[PDB]
Structures are given as C-alpha cells and as structure tokens.
Design a protein around this motif. Structure first.
Motif, PDB file in Angstrom:
ATOM      1  N   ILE B 535       0.862  -1.111   0.043  1.00 36.07           N
ATOM      2  CA  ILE B 535       0.034  -0.036   0.006  1.00 36.07           C
ATOM      3  C   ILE B 535       0.707   1.399  -0.232  1.00 36.07           C
ATOM      4  O   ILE B 535       1.857   1.675   0.891  1.00 36.07           O
ATOM      5  CB  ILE B 535      -0.831   0.079   1.134  1.00 36.07           C
ATOM      6  N   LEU B 546      -8.512   1.241   5.371  1.00 35.51           N
ATOM      7  CA  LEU B 546      -8.585   0.418   4.472  1.00 35.51           C
ATOM      8  C   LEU B 546      -9.592  -0.361   4.132  1.00 35.51           C
ATOM      9  O   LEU B 546      -9.700  -1.572   3.903  1.00 35.51           O
ATOM     10  CB  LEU B 546      -7.293  -0.673   5.167  1.00 35.51           C
ATOM     11  N   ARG B 549      -9.516  -1.516   0.676  1.00 37.15           N
ATOM     12  CA  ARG B 549      -8.314  -2.399   0.379  1.00 37.15           C
ATOM     13  C   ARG B 549      -8.829  -3.836   0.809  1.00 37.15           C
ATOM     14  O   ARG B 549      -8.712  -4.826   0.189  1.00 37.15           O
ATOM     15  CB  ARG B 549      -7.229  -2.262   1.038  1.00 37.15           C
TER      16      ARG B 549
END
Lengths: 269, 1525
Positions: B535, B546, B549
């Motif tokens: 990242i 996140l 992600r």
C-alpha cells in the motif's frame, strides 16, 4: 497368461469395459417363427460386460419367465454367477446348477458368456458344454434353453443367440475332445434364435454365497463337484481385490524398515 | 464503490519465516566481525542480567494463593519473570502477552493462568468440579504436545483433572474428550476440528486459550494461528461472553502488534523482556560460508566442525544438530576417524585412563543402534529412527555426563528436555518435500535447538555455534538478537481461509468478510506498515480505514472460490453461497485448486488405476518433481506395484503414485529424497483421499465410493485388502499371520471353527486360543430387514442391526463407525445412505434404523443393503433385499379438481342467526368450503372432505351441524378428534359458536363413564376423543343415548394411520354397524388432510364418489412456500447447534417483519433457542427488532411472570412456550404474539397440536427427538410435521405463508417426497386387535368365529388389505387370499385370547367371555395387563407387591424416558420407601413405581416428572379396582 505382466495389461484394459457398454449389436437373422424369442434386459447385460475380461471367458446362467398370456416369448429376468474360470476359448463352471429361493419362481433359459474373438458360429466347446449340461439336467429343456454369445468387437460388444438342434445335442453328449476342431462337428448342430435387448424391465443378479464368482486367479480352488449357495447381490469386477488374494498377500517385509525416517511429523489429528 | 481484482502472487512473501523484513541489523555490545578465507565468522559475548530493582524479591511457592500451590512440588522458588507477572496472572482476566527469551521457563507462567481458571470453579466439599470449564493449550510442535500432556498429567493429577492430547479422529473420540479438560493441540488440529464443528460442542465452556510459541505467526503455518485467534475474537464480539487469551513468544519486535491482535491492553496486559533474561547467558558464534562451490563447502564445514569441537575437547559438552536422519551417525565416525587420523590426538576425553568412567562407556556395549562402534570411544548418536528405548538410555547417559559429544536431530530439542554446555548447528538447511527443494530451517527450529544451549544447573554460561551460508548470516542475527519483524503470511492462504469461514456460516456476504479480515494479524500489519504490504501512503490517506483495500482484498478470494466452485457469489448482492464441494474442501483442509481438479477429473466410471492418478494430480503436490538419480529406483518400484501406473511415464504423477503404492505396499526406499517425499505424500493422502470419498459419495456413485473408502482404509492401516484382516490387530505375531495367509482359507470361515479347529489349519495349535480371541474381536454385524411398500414409487425399510462381535475398548474403543448404504440393482447407484454409529454401551443391543427408498419403472429384481465399518478394513456385510415377490400398491387416482366457483357469501344460508357467527369474521367462504357447501349443507348424505391442514374443514363440519340444527330442535351430534388438545381447542370455539349464540347446549367428554353418560343427551353437540367414545359406546346396545344420534363427525381421520389410530377406526366402524341396526340412517361426515387413497376411506365410511371431495395439497386458501434444509451432521447436539444461525437468517430472509413460530425438539431447547435468536440478533447491529411496542407497554404483562429468563426474552420480542409454563404465562405469551407485540415465539414440539395462535413463517428445527427407552433419537411423526407446517396460515391478511424445515441429511429426501404429495393411509387394526375382539365378544357382538370375520369386514383394514397386500403381509390379491388371511387372523386372535383365559372357545366354533376378559372390557384395560395381573397376584401378595404389579401394567409403558433420566431416577429411588431388585432406570415401569411411591410419600418433585405423576394417577384407580376384582 504370463501371470505377472499379462495380468496388468489386461487389468488396466478392463477398466474401460464400460465404454463398450453403450455400443452393442445384435444378430438379426432368419426367424424360425415356431421358435421362442428371448428378451434380455439391458441392465444385466451392461453389468455382465463390465465385470468381464477381454481374454478369459466368463459365463452366467439365465433365468426367466414368459409374460402372462404370451407363451412364445421368454423374458430373461435374472443372471446367476457361479464359481468359475475361463480360457480364451471356453469356460469351466461347476456341475451343480443354481439352487435358491428367488429362483424358484422362474425357469432356466440357459447361459451367456463372453467371447474374446467374434466368430459366426457356436464354438464346439459350447455345443458340447450345453449338451453335457442338458444330459445331466432334465430341468433344462432342449427347446427352451439357449446359449447367448457376447463377443467383444472393436470398441464394442456384439451378441448372438443359439439353440442346439437334436443332431447337435447328441454329438455334444457324445463328444470328448475339446480342441477347436473335434471330429464330427457340424454347422447342423446349432441354430440361431431370436433375441432382443430391452429397457422396459430390469433384470437382477444372483451371486455366490460365501465367496465371489471369479476363480480365474485360483484354479486349484475350483472343482467340478464343488457346491455353492447363492445370494441377492451384484457381481464384483474381474480384477476386484477379492478375486485376487495372492497378489494382495504379497508382502515380505520386516517391520523395522519403519525405524528409518523416524521423524514422525503429523500435526493433523 | 465497485471492487477491483488484484494479483495475490506478487503480493505475498516467498521464503516466509526466513523473510527478514528489515534489511538492516545491529551489533550487540562487545561483538566483532572476523572474516577468514571462505567464511566470515561473527562473535557476540554473553548478555549482562538487569540488576535487581529496589526491593524486588523472588516469590516462593508459599506466598502465592493457597490452592494453586498444589502440584508445584519439587520446586521451592519462582523464576524471576514468573515472579514478575504472577500477580497479573492470577489476579486479572486481562489478556496476556509475554516476550521472553528461550530458557526463561515461560510455561509455568501460562500454567498459573490455568490454575486461576481451575480455581474459578471450586467448591468446599468438592474440589475443581470439572464440567464447568475446559482449557485449550495450543503448542507449535507435536513432540512438545506429547511430552507436555505427559508432564501436565503428573503435575495437575493432585487435582485429579484429566488432561490429554487431541489426536482424536473426530467421531470416535469426541464423547471421549467430552470428559477431558485442558486439551493440548497443534493450531492446525484446532482449525480442522473447528471447521467440522467438533469444537462447537466444546465452546462456551472455554474460558481460556493458550497460544504457546505464538511467534509461529511468522511461519508459513502462520495463517492458521491467525485463523484461530481471529475466529475466537470475532466470535466473542457476537456472544458477549469473553475468554482469556495468553500469548507466549520468543523475544522479537512487533510485540505491540501481536498485542493488538490478541486484544491485550498494552497498559496492564503487555509484558516484554529482552535477551538478557535467558537463565544461562549465551555467547553467540555464527560462521557464514562464502564458498559458492558446494563440493569445497562440504569440506570446509567439516573442518570448522572439527576445530570447533576440538576447542571443547577438554572438560565441556558438545551437541550437534544435523538435519539428516542417517547423517546423525555419518557426522559421527567422521570425528572418530579424524581423531584416529590425528595419531591418537583429541582422544583421552577423560581425566586419566580409568578416570571419568570409561568403564561406563565400555560396559554399555551391546545396543540396538550403531552405537556399538561409537560407544567405546567418547561419543554417540541420538534420533527417533534406530531405537525406541535406547534413546532414553542415551539421554540418561548424557544427563550424567558420561558422553561429552552427542550428534542428533531437532526432534531431540523439541522432545524430552536436556541441555548441553555448548551446541553446534550444522548447516541450517533442510529438505522440504512441500517446497520440492532444499530450504533453510524455520525460525522455531533454531530458536528451540539453540535455546538448548547451556545447563541451568551444572553450567556457568552457555555458548552456541551456528554454521550457515554467509548469505543467510544476516538473517540468523536478526533472530537470536531481537531485530526481526513478525509478519503475516496470511495473503497466500486468504482464499482458503475465506471459504472455511463461509462454510461455518460466519460470513454471509462481502461486508461480513471485510469485518472478519478486520480481525486478522495481517490487518494490523497492513495498518501499521502499509509500505511493506503493498500500500502506497497516498491511497492509504485516501482510504484510512482500509475499507476499500479489505473490500478489494477478499474480492479476489471470492472470485477464486467462485471459479473453482467452492462458493456461488454474484457481484451484485455481494452474498456468498456455500457448495458441498466447498464444505468438503474446508473439512479436509484441502486447497481450492486441488478440489476443482477433483471436480473436473472425478467421474462415476473411474478404475483404481485412474483413481490413483487423480490423487496424484492434487494441487497440494504441485512442487514435487522427479530427480535424475532416483529415476533408477522409481523404475524398480514401478514394476513392483499392484496397481498399474502405466497410464503415466516418469513425471511427477508417476513418482507420487508409485510412492503412495510403495507406502501402502510397505516398501523401504534407498534414496533419502524419496523417503521424505513419500512421507509428505502419504501424510497428506489421508485428507485428500477422504475428501475424494466424501465428494464421490455425496454424488451417489456406488462403485467409486467403495474404491475410495477402501483406499482410505488401506492408507490408514498401511496394507492392501488382499492381506488378512487379523493384521489390523497389531497384537498378533507376524509369522502366524503370514502362515494363515499361506493356506487360502476365506476369513469369514473362521467363525465356524472353535479354538482347536483354528489351530489345526496352520498346524500351530498353541496359537489356537489367541487367534480365536481376535477373530471374535473383529467387528461383525448381522442384519435383518422388514420391507413394506408405501406407494408404487416408495418402499419402507426397517433394518435391524445386531452386533455379532465381542467389544474391547482397548481395541474398538469408545465408539465404532459404520456406513449403511442401499445400492440399486447393479450396485451402481446409491439410492440411500446413513452414517450409523454404535457406541460402547450398546454393543449387543440391536439397533433399528428406518428409512424409505424409491423404486422405478422397470421394477428390479432386488436392492442391496450394504454395511461397512469406516475405519476397519475388510469389514463388511451385504444384504440382498429381493423384490421377486413384491406387490406394488394400486396407483392413486387424481384428486377431485377444484372447480372455479363464485366464492360463496355468508348470505347463502337463509338463516340470519347462523349468518351472525360468520359475517363479522370473514366476508366469503374459501373455494374448498364453497365447493363442499351444497353437498354438506343442502343435502343429507355422508361426505368426505380431504384438504391439507389449513383449508377450513372445521366449518365444513359446522355446515352439517347447522343442517342438523334445522332438522330438529333436540337433534343430537357427536364430534371426534384424535388429539385431546385439538378437542379442547374445538370445544372452546364451538361453545361460543353454539351454546352462546344459538342457545344449544355443548359438551366435552371426559374420563369417567358416569359423568360422561350424563353429559351426552343433555348436549346437542358432544365433543370427544376416540378412547372416551370407545369405552362408552362399546356397550351401545344398552345405552339409548348412543343410538339416537343424528350426526357423526370424524375430524382428522387420516390419523387412523398413526398409533391410537385403531381405536379411531374401530369407533367409526362401530358407528356404521349401529346405523345398520338402528334402521335409521346416521349421517357420517369425515374430515381428513389430503389423502391419496381417499377412495378407500370413503368406501369404508359410506360416501358416494359424487359426495367425495379429496383435494391436492396445492389447493389451500393461502398458498404455502415450503423449503427443506439438509444438514450433514449426524451427531444431534452438533447438528442442532449448527442450525442456530440459519434460524435467524431464515427469519431475516423469508419473513423479516411478520410473525414467526419456531418448533424445537426439547422442552428446554425452547429457552436456549430464544436466547440464541437474541444473541445473534445483536450481531446484525440490530437490537430488539422483534419487539413492536415500547417497554412501558409490556410491564403490565411481565408482572405476572415467575420465569426470570422469560422476562428477558420477552423484553426483546421473543418469548417461548413449553410444558412447565403456568397456563397464565402461556396465555400471556400467546396474547402478546397474536396482538402483534412480539414478532417471534419459540415453542416446544408437544405444543404443535394444542396451539391456538398462528403465524406467517414457521421454522421446524431438527425433526428428531430423544427416547430414553431404546436410547436413540426417533423422527417426528409425519402428521405432526404436517401440523406444524399448517401452523403457518394467516388468511385474513397474508397472500402467502412460509415454512423452513431444517433436518438431517438422511431425512431430507423423505420430506421432499411426502410433504408435497397427498398422503397414503393404512390400517393398524391388524396389530392392535385382541382388546376389541375381547370387548366385542363381551357385548355378544361376536358370538362365534363367524361373527368375528364379519366384524372384520366392517373395518378400514378390510378395505386396505387387498389394496396394498404386502403391507399387511398378505401374499396375494386374490379372493381366497384375503379370505384365508382374515381367517388366520380371527383364528390367532381368538386363540391368543383363549390362552389368556379372557374367553372360552367351544366346539372350535363358538366363543364366550370369561371372568378375566369381563374385567378387562369393563375397566377398559389392555388384556395383557390383566393377564400379567393373573399370573402375578397370589394369595400372599400385599401393597409392596401390588405397587410393582400395578406398575408393570401396559398403560404405564406409554410413560417415556428423557435425556439422562438414568441418574435422575436413581437419585430418587435411593430415597424411596421400597427399594427394587436390580432395576433398570430407563424402564418406564420402574419409573412409575418410583413416581407412585413418591406420590405416596408426598414428596414434591420437579414439575417435569410431576406432570408424569399426575398422568399415572389419572388411570391408576381403574387398575387398582381391577386388582380388587
């Protein structure tokens, strides 16, 4: 057979027998019309082809009844497998005919066997076998019982159905010599008969009581005078573990081989 | 935002645990680099212990709490660190993390964390009562687990607490480890066993889990520990019940990250100690080798070994860890031959010639290993391979310092604990068959083996020497001094981890998936070091949490699982659906590539030849390759294998195949590479082959499931089937086995032979007895079957399994497992299969399994019923089930079509007074009613109306009742229902419908003859249950009130099919006989559910076909959506538990906002399920969703409550109903539900019948229940199930109604077939027969045998017998067939009745009642009962005897036995006035004796058995009086 290499080639071969199962041909030829006509349920045929081997003949015994109000057709409703072993050209099965309760309801129609090479005739070994059954068995009627020969054609299976003629029956009762060309053998001895496959009804199997049927892998354990009982259950395949004890009983080993690699890693259960 | 797909390949870390995330390292203080030729050598000195802090002392075993002190014996003082944290250990439930160097003695810290919990449950008069708690200790290595259970047992034994290793196969040892606490296991074991659910019976009894050597997070094995802990945490958040977590780690940075992961409060929960706290200070030597050429290197390292070893050749001790098996002794003898090549220099390892005990090393001479060569000199070798006991005999020799040089393997460091003054690690590289190549050994392996350096007692300071490759030299420094980051390998496994969580149902959709991953170690690492994990900081700023992600992550896993068919997940909803393939995959810990390889490769027609190849193609083996050097041996092995590989040449497939065979065929291999490889293959093979079996069995392909289970067994046992089964008993001599294999004598032929006849075969008679033992130890079942046809499509099978073998728990253990599977005609297709498990207790007890199988259009000669042991090889019994004589039932005519009618208004009946009791309820009658109307109302003839329950037939009856009302003022009507509950339910309605509005008196029959008689004849409508209307109306000839009835109504007549059906049948039949003699017609109206054979019922009850309405279940006022949910878990607790979450989901899906009823198997289960519905209600983030009013409104209702938990469950909108609740409590709950206040009610199954409050969705949970009498579970009676289903009806409002039935695998198909089709119904009178003939003979209705046959012709049995003769065991459909059958029937009924002296049979023709029968008939008592009485009561009998004699009465065997009532009744029987003679406590006669004495002693018992007492008492007096007579 070579008994080592010969076993395995045919063994990995036979694992494809079920492929044959869906391509089969049936002899259509001149119908006597005064004769009986036999219907073989397709399921037993499939299974019977599937247990077999492409060299050793296996055989099975036909049991059936004629449908109500239709005496000239014989439905084959059952196949019985007995302790037996084959050659490439014939099959040795014991003197005792099947005795059992499920069988009491039906009549014997003869027998069926696998035939490694296709021939357009009933092998002398067969007419002789059949006559010799018939001699010892009144239970088997000359006119009502047949020999169905199921031959392995390329990628296929193909079958014919024979009846002994009286000429044939007498020759066969008489005949000693089992060679491929005995004296006095004639095409006059047998007759083709009408047979149809069917998906309309299911046939069932009868199988040895305390063992299985296939004695090919023990020839010394088979005897003409051997007795057997039966049960309702399906046949195991030719190369099935059970038919082959001598081979799974090959272990000569000392346990302490396990001493080596005594790192035991497991971690799972 | 929409997710994006990413590549997980470049996103993982290859060479994990060797990772070394930091690229920079550090010196210690006095450390120096000195490089020599070909090798750099680094030296660091020992650490300096931190000086004791102001007033800091060690803690003795005195000054810590009283109880825990036990089991510390032999140890006077606590270690410095132990002493540091003992306070937080025993005084707080706060989670722990300790980081302390190897040797600090970490275990005894965690031990205390256990002794706290062990102390949490304690009593005065008993200590540590053990059913409250269980502890789970997770250790990284197997040897360590073994030895730990070994010493933990000894230590904790003072408490008598039972601690064991969990090596259990799931099913045999669960009920074994049920009684086990503080269970030790490898993280993996815990993960599979949790994926299967073996844990879910254990959990919530777990307050503590220990993670020992948690630094295994850095290993490739890391994701497992990550999966465990994540699950534990994520789970605690749902349950709100917490658990202590105690982490133990080597000293490494990233400690605070592991802290975050374990939810350890850094403030009070975190503990860190650096490398200075190692009890024996460590001087570290590291020699990295620069040589590229390996050929020169394998010299250089030898020489470094020699110089290093000669350095310590004086008084000191050296230990060499080689990673090879054989090289343990190849390294030795090199040192020896070198010392000999040294001109006898280096020798004299002692203080002299005789000194230092050289006679110790010489006198130990003869030993199993190669030691005989090395032992005369100064050194020896150790490892698991060569010996068993001589390892312990060498360890003894090293501890006492008679050998100063010992070369060994890592299993010595991981096993029993002995240190060495100085240890030397040779090479650090090992062979990984998993990786296919060589790789440097793991973190924990060195850490463990170098943490063995120096003795705690006999030593001053320890040193250690790591000889490695220079390139890895940096790495091994970052470890043994704390430089190394602990990072997660989780990404590699992420697809497999996600699956198993969907499989457990812990993640439904993408959102739950991101929530789950938010609990991972990888999450906090991705948070605190995004730079490392892929990242960039800018997109990290763009998504701080996140969320995107973690949404991208797991999306790729979802796609991978979809592409391999583990999961069906569409991108739109974000929801996952599990597939059986997925479950199999999770359960066997097999990767998702392997499983799809199996999906595409596996076909029904596969030979063994091919099965092996498919096994070889397993993605788990992807890196295994075939080396040139070994291809010489592989060829030999290839020709010595039984199963042809020859499909393949030399490639990995062949190597793996020939290897598996070699292992099974038990063959030793020359090459070492192949050995390790083979080991890998065979160990993974169990799970692999098993997942194959499971798959191929779920498909139903018979032949291949045989081939695969047999393979499984052959792997497990390490033999082919062609070998004698006696081998699975390892207790047997090899030569004897080989001897019985020599002569071919089929194994099942050993049972016929006695002890002598056995020995005579092999001519070894001395063995004759022992062999025999084993032959009868070998598991054997014999099996019988009772088969009856149900419909032309389906037959019913009752399989009776009778154990034929002698049980020994040192062989068969706690449980024995068997698959029963019924195979079709060709043994091709598996028509049905169950997992049957016979426990220890029940060997010799015949078990009865009942199951249905289909039949098909070419009716086949037979099926086969196969039974095979799971684990046992060559253990099988086949049972041909022949249809040769089968007679299938007549196919059933189509149900009468539902006409399309103008829906009838209530304005039809011209009577206003009638209209009034309908019009303000519903505007229109339903199509069923409107179609029946003219026939039932405007016309006088007998009708039959079947329609599936919920169709409104009650008011169909009410039509006929209204007609009779018009017919006569005083017109008399009798109404019957088979269920007493249903009867009261009818009475409450009809009393207001008729007596209140229409002034016509309505009554409800009861027990007593007198009161009941008086009841009818005053009433217009008499409501009763079949037994009440049998006793009264048997005598009907004398009672004019029976004869004069206008209308007769039978509701739920299909119930004839069930037990207490014969009585119903007999009363309807009798009713007809009466209408025959009375010369007046008595209208009969019968009401049933949908009935396939309705024609017979009608013909019996005298309805013309034109007035017969039989409707299909698809005709219902309110349509029904039925769903059936199969669960493959046979063990009922686990099953029942694992359907908890699906219940909630079934609500949220099918009926989120509408009323819901949930039926349960147990009285108590109702509470628990209401609770669980509430606790998983929190999960949704949605609290009290099922409460539709404010809490202020419920207060007036809650004031009336006793049950405290019920208050809670009701407060959140649930509540429950069961046996024990006060009728006021029940009425209240019902009120709250129907009014709409509470949206969900959990109800006991027993309450399905008598419940007056309906719903929208109905969820049936687990259709079996428990019966103590045979100690087994038994299925819900089908009509019950149909009733529960009919309880979802709300015609007033809903356009639909919904039902979800969660049941076992076995029971799935049965419901799929019979809930939708109309039902067949058969007569049971043939079985329950005597009582009525007796009673009828008494009335002189049967004066002689002829009258008996005639009586038979009035029945429903008469009707059915010729319809489905095989069911009644009637062998033909003919006339004389049926005639002979009925004849034989009255023949034997009258005989049996005459034998019992209830009747006298004269001339062989006539009959007359006798004393006994007269009594029986008078009091309505079973005939066998009073026969028992007749042979029991004697001249001298008194109340002691009268108690037991009246207890054995037949009417008291209806009394059941509940879950663990064997201890309960024993505890009661102890304190009762009269004891019993060796009573069995599962027997209802014993129970009624004890309950009766309890009543006589005025003992107040639990309401559970108190209800029972009351029921006994209800019928007691009659029996007593009968005794008087």
């Amino acid at each position: 057979f070579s008994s080592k290499t010969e076993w395995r080639v045919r063994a990995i071969s036979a694992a494809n027998l079920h492929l044959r199962t869906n391509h089969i041909y049936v002899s259509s030829d001149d119908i006597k019309e005064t004769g009986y006509t036999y219907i073989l349920p397709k399921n037993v045929l499939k299974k019977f082809i599937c247990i077999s081997d492409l060299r050793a003949q296996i055989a099975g015994y036909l049991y059936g009844v004629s449908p109500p109000d239709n005496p000239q057709v014989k439905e084959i409703r059952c196949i019985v497998m007995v302790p037996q072993w084959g050659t490439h050209q014939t099959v040795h099965l014991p003197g005792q005919l099947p005795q059992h309760e499920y069988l009491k309801e039906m009549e014997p129609l003869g027998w069926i066997h696998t035939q490694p090479n296709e021939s357009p005739q009933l092998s002398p070994q067969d007419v002789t076998t059949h006559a010799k059954i018939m001699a010892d068995n009144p239970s088997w009627d000359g006119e009502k019982t047949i020999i169905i020969t199921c031959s392995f054609t390329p990628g296929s299976c193909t079958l014919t159905a024979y009846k002994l003629t009286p000429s044939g029956y007498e020759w066969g009762r008489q005949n000693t010599d089992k060679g491929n060309n005995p004296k006095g053998y004639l095409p006059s001895h047998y007759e083709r008969v009408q047979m149809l496959l069917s998906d309309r009804f299911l046939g069932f199997f009868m199988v040895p009581a305390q063992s299985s049927w296939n004695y090919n892998f023990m020839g010394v354990r088979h005897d003409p005078n051997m007795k057997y009982e039966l049960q309702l259950a399906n046949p195991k395949e030719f190369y099935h573990e059970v038919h082959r004890p001598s081979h799974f009983l090959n272990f000569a080993l000392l346990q302490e081989g396990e001493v080596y690699s005594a790192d035991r890693e497991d971690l799972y259960a | 935002a929409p997710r994006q797909v990413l590549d997980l390949e470049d996103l993982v870390f290859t060479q994990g645990s060797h990772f070394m995330a930091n690229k920079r390292c550090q010196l210690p203080d006095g450390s120096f680099r000195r490089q020599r030729k070909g090798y750099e050598e680094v030296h660091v000195p020992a650490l300096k212990p931190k000086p004791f802090g102001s007033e800091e002392q060690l803690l003795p075993v005195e000054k810590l709490p009283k109880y825990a002190q036990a089991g510390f014996e032999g140890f006077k003082t606590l270690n410095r660190i132990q002493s540091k944290l003992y306070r937080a250990a025993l005084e707080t439930d706060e989670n722990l993390l300790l980081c302390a160097p190897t040797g600090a003695g970490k275990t005894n810290v965690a031990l205390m964390c256990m002794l706290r919990e062990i102390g949490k449950h304690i009593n005065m008069d008993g200590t540590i009562n053990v059913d409250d708690f269980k502890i789970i200790y997770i250790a990284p290595m197997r040897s360590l687990v073994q030895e730990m259970v070994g010493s933990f047992g000894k230590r904790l034994a003072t408490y008598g607490i039972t601690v064991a290793e969990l090596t259990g196969d799931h099913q045999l040892c669960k009920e074994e480890i049920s009684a086990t606490q503080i269970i030790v296991c490898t993280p993996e074991k815990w993960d599979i066993i949790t994926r299967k659910g073996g844990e879910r019976t254990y959990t919530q009894l777990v307050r503590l889990i220990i993670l020992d050597e948690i630094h295994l997070l850095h290993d490739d094995r890391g994701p497992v520990l990550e999966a465990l802990v994540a699950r534990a945490i994520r789970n605690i958040e749902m349950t709100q019940e917490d658990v202590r977590l105690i982490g133990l780690s080597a000293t490494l940075p990233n400690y605070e990250d592991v802290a975050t992961f374990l939810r350890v409060d850094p403030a009070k929960g975190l503990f860190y100690f650096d490398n200075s706290f190692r009890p024996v200070p460590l001087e570290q030597t590291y020699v990295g080798i620069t040589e590229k050429k390996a050929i020169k290197r394998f010299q250089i390292m030898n020489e470094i070994v020699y110089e290093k070893i000669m350095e310590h050749a004086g008084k000191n001790q050296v230990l060499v860890f080689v990673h090879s098996r054989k090289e343990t002794g190849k390294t030795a003898r090199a040192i020896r031959d070198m010392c000999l090549e040294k001109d006898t220099l280096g020798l004299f390892l002692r203080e002299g010639s005789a000194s230092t005990e050289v006679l110790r090393t010489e006198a130990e001479q003869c030993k199993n290993l190669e030691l005989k060569d090395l032992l005369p000199y100064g050194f020896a070798i150790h490892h698991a391979g060569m010996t068993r006991v001589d390892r312990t005999l060498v360890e003894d020799l090293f501890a006492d310092k008679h050998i100063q040089v010992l070369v060994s393997t890592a299993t010595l460091a991981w096993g029993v604990n002995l240190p060495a003054h100085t240890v030397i690690i040779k090479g650090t590289q090992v062979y990984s068959p998993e990786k296919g190549r060589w790789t440097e050994l793991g973190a924990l392996d060195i850490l463990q083996m170098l943490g063995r350096a120096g003795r705690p007692q006999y030593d001053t300071k320890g040193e250690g020497i790591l000889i490695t490759s220079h390139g890895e030299l940096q790495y091994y420094l970052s470890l043994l001094n704390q430089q190394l980051p602990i990072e997660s390998q989780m990404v590699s496994k992420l697809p497999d981890m996600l699956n198993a969580e969907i499989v457990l149902g812990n993640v439904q959709n993408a959102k739950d998936a991101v929530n789950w991953l938010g609990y991972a170690y990888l999450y906090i690492r991705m948070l605190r070091s995004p730079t490392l994990y892929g990242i960039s900081h800018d997109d990290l700023k763009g998504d701080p949490l996140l969320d995107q992600r973690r949404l991208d992550l797991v999306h790729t896993a979802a796609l991978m699982l979809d592409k391999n068919n583990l999961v069906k997940y569409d991108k739109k909803t974000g929801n996952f659906q599990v597939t059986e393939l997925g479950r199999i995959a999770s359960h066997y810990y097999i990767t998702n590539d392997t499983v799809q390889t199996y999906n595409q490769l596996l076909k029904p027609t596969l030979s063994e030849i091919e099965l092996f190849r498919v096994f070889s193609l397993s993605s788990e083996f992807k890196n295994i390759t075939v080396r040139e050097e070994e291809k010489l041996e592989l060829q030999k092995l290839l020709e010595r294998v039984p199963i042809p590989v020859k499909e393949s040449i030399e490639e990995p497939s062949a190597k793996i195949n020939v290897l598996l065979q070699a292992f099974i065929s038990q063959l030793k291999l020359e090459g070492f590479a192949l050995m390790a490889d083979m080991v890998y293959v065979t160990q993974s093979a169990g799970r692999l082959m098993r997942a194959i079996f499971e798959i191929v069995l779920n498909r139903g392909w018979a032949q291949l499931t045989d081939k695969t289970l047999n393979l499984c067994k052959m792997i497990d046992k390490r033999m082919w089937q062609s070998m004698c089964p006696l081998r699975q008993f390892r207790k047997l001599p090899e030569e004897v086995v080989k001897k019985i294999e020599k002569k071919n004598f089929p194994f099942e032929r050993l049972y016929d032979l006695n002890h002598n006849e056995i020995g005579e075969l092999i001519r070894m008679p001395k063995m004759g007895k022992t062999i025999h033992k084993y032959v009868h130890l070998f598991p054997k079942l014999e099996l019988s079957v009772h088969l009856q046809p149900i419909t032309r499509s389906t037959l019913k099978v009752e399989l009776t399994i009778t154990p034929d073998f002698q049980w020994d728990e040192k062989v068969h253990g706690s449980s024995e497992a068997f698959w029963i599977l019924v195979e079709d005609v060709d043994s091709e297709v598996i028509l049905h299969h169950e997992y049957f498990l016979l426990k220890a207790k029940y060997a010799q007890d015949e078990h009865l399994i009942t199951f249905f199988v289909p039949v098909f259009e070419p009716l086949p000669p037979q099926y086969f019923i196969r039974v095979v042991s799971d684990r046992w090889l060559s253990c099988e019994t086949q049972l041909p089930v022949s249809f040769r004589h089968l007679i299938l039932p007549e196919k059933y005519p189509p149900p009468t079509e539902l006409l399309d009618l103008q829906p009838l208004p209530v304005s039809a009946l011209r009577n206003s007074a009638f209209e009034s009791l309908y019009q303000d309820k519903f505007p229109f009658f339903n199509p069923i009613q409107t179609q029946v109307f003219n026939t039932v109302y405007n016309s006088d003839d007998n009708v039959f109306v079947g329609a599936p329950t919920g169709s409104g037939k009650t008011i169909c009856a009410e039509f006929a009742i209204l007609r009779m009302l018009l017919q006569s003022s005083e017109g008399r009507c009798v109404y019957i229902t088979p269920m007493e509950a249903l009867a009261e339910q009818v009475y409450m309605d009809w009393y207001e419908k008729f007596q209140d509005r229409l002034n016509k008196k309505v009554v409800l029959l009861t027990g007593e003859t007198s009161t009941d008689l008086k009841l009818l004849g005053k009433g217009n409508i008499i409501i009763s249950t079949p037994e009440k209307w049998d006793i009264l109306s048997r005598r009907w000839k004398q009672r004019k009130n029976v004869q004069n009835i206008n209308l007769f109504v039978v509701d739920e007549v299909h119930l004839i099919g069930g037990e207490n059906g014969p009585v119903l049948e007999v009363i309807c039949s009798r009713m007809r006989y009466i209408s025959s003699q009375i010369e007046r017609p008595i209208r009969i109206v019968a009401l049933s559910s949908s009935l396939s054979n309705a024609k017979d019922v009608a013909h019996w009850l005298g309805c013309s076909a034109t007035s017969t309405f039989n409707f299909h279940p698809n005709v219902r006022p309110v349509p029904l959506e039925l769903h059936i949910q199969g669960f493959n878990i046979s063990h009922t607790q686990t099953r029942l538990l694992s359907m908890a979450k699906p219940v909630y989901h079934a609500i949220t899906k099918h009926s989120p906002k509408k009323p819901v009823i949930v039926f349960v198997p147990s009285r108590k289960q109702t509470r628990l399920t209401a609770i669980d519905i509430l606790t998983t209600c929190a999960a949704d983030i949605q609290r009290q969703r099922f409460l539709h009013c404010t809490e202020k409104d419920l207060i007036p209702y809650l004031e009336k409550l006793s049950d405290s938990t019920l208050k809670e469950t009701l407060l959140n909108g649930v509540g429950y109903l069961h046996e024990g609740l006060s009728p006021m409590e029940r009425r209240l709950v019902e009120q709250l539900f129907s009014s709409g206040a509470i949206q969900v009610v959990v109800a006991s199954r027993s309450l399905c019948w008598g419940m007056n409050v309906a719903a929208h969705l109905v969820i049936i949970m687990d259709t079996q229940y428990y019966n103590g009498k045979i100690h087994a579970y038994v299925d819900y009676p089908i009509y019950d199930v149909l009733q529960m289903v009919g309880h979802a009806n709300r015609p007033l409002q809903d356009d639909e109604g919904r039902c979800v039935i969660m049941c076992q695998g076995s029971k799935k198909d049965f419901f799929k077939k019979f809930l939708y089709e109309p039902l067949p119904v058969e007569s049971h009178l043939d079985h329950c027969m005597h009582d009525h003939f007796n009673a009828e003979i008494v009335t002189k209705t049967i004066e002689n045998k002829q009258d008996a046959v005639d009586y038979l012709t009035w029945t429903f049995l008469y009707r059915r017998m010729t319809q489905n003769p095989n069911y009644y065991n009637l062998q033909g459909i003919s006339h004389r067939h049926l005639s002979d059958h009925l004849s034989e029937l009255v023949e034997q009924t009258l005989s049996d009745l005459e034998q019992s002296k209830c009747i006298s049979i004269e001339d062989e023709m006539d009959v007359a009642p006798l004393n006994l029968g007269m009594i029986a008939a008078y009091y309505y008592i079973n005939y066998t009962t009073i026969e028992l009485f007749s042979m029991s009561l004697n001249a001298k009998t008194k109340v002691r005897g009268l108690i037991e004699i009246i207890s054995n009465a037949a009417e008291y065997e209806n009394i059941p036995i509940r879950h663990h009532e064997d201890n309960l009744l024993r505890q009661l029987a102890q304190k009762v006035p009269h004891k019993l003679n060796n009573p069995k406590f599962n027997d209802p006669h014993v129970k009624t004796n004890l309950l009766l004495q309890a009543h006589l002693s005025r003992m107040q018992l639990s309401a559970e058995l108190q209800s029972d007492t009351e029921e006994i008492l209800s019928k007691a007096i009659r029996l007593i009086q009968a005794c008087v007579d």
